[PDB]
Amino acid sequence: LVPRGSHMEDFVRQCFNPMIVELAEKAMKEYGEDPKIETNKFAATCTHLEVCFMYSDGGSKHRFEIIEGRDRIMAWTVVNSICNTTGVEKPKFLPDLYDYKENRFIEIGVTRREVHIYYLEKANKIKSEKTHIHIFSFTGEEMATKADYTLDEESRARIKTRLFTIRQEMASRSLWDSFRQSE
Ligand SMILES: COc1cc(CCNC(=O)c2nc(-c3ccccc3C)[nH]c(=O)c2O)ccc1O
Ligand SMILES: [Mn+2]
Numbered sequence: 001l002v003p004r005g006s007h008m009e010d011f012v013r014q015c016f017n018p019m020i021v022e023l024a025e026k027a028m029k030e031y032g033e034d035p036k037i038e039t040n041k042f043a044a045t046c047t048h049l050e051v052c053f054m055y056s057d058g059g060s061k062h063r064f065e066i067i068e069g070r071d072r073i074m075a076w077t078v079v080n081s082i083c084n085t086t087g088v089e090k091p092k093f094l095p096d097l098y099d100y101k102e103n104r105f106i107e108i109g110v111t112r113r114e115v116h117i118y119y120l121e122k123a124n125k126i127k128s129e130k131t132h133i134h135i136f137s138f139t140g141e142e143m144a145t146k147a148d149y150t151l152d153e154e155s156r157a158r159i160k161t162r163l164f165t166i167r168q169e170m171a172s173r174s175l176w177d178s179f180r181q182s183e
């Protein structure tokens with residue numbers, strides 16, 4: 001029932017850096033998913049992963065603590081350390097980053113719908129008011145809590161450009177339509 005490859009899989013392996021592909025594979029397998037069949041979720045996990053890493057690449061050297069990309073047990077271990085060090089409330093859901101400069105966790109979101117729908121979706125799940133939310137879209141829009149976009153405009157514009165490039169590469173392969181209507 002598991003195939004030897006699809007068009008979305010070969011594109012993902014060609015589109016994203018190999019370390020991004022390996023971490024997304026480990027993330028889905030940890031949660032009982034196979035990138036070879038769940039190929040749309042495979043591309044989304046890679047995209048969310050690259051956005052998280054470009055995000056932390058913005059700002060100072062020691063500004064961010066990367067939560068995404070670690071295994072669930074170690075990600076929660078770093079979260080407990082951050083909460084037990086700074087005093088920030090432990091979030092109910094595992095976030096993506098921690099901002100040592102702003103003293104808050106960040107939940108990064110990447111949507112194929114309107115940024116308005118996803119942000120409201122993540123906000124109603126986040127509860128913990130302290131967790132900052134920052135949503136990106138494949139169209140170039142972005143939403144952040146309190147209109148506080150954390151990073152510089154150049155770092156965010158770089159992320160938006162990459163998202164639209166991934167969109168164009170998918171569409172030229174006739175893979176974008178099935179990718180959008182699958183979120
Ligand atoms: C149960 O689903 C998974 C959960 C994990 C744990 C860590 N991932 C997140 O916490 C996370 N997931 C997503 C996400 C959700 C659905 C489709 C694609 C995406 C990209 N969007 C985020 O913003 C985020 O932070 C790993 C793989 C999964 O398949
Ligand atoms: Mn996450």
Ligand SMILES: [Mn+2]
Nearest residue numbers: 096107108109
């Ligand atoms: Mn996220």
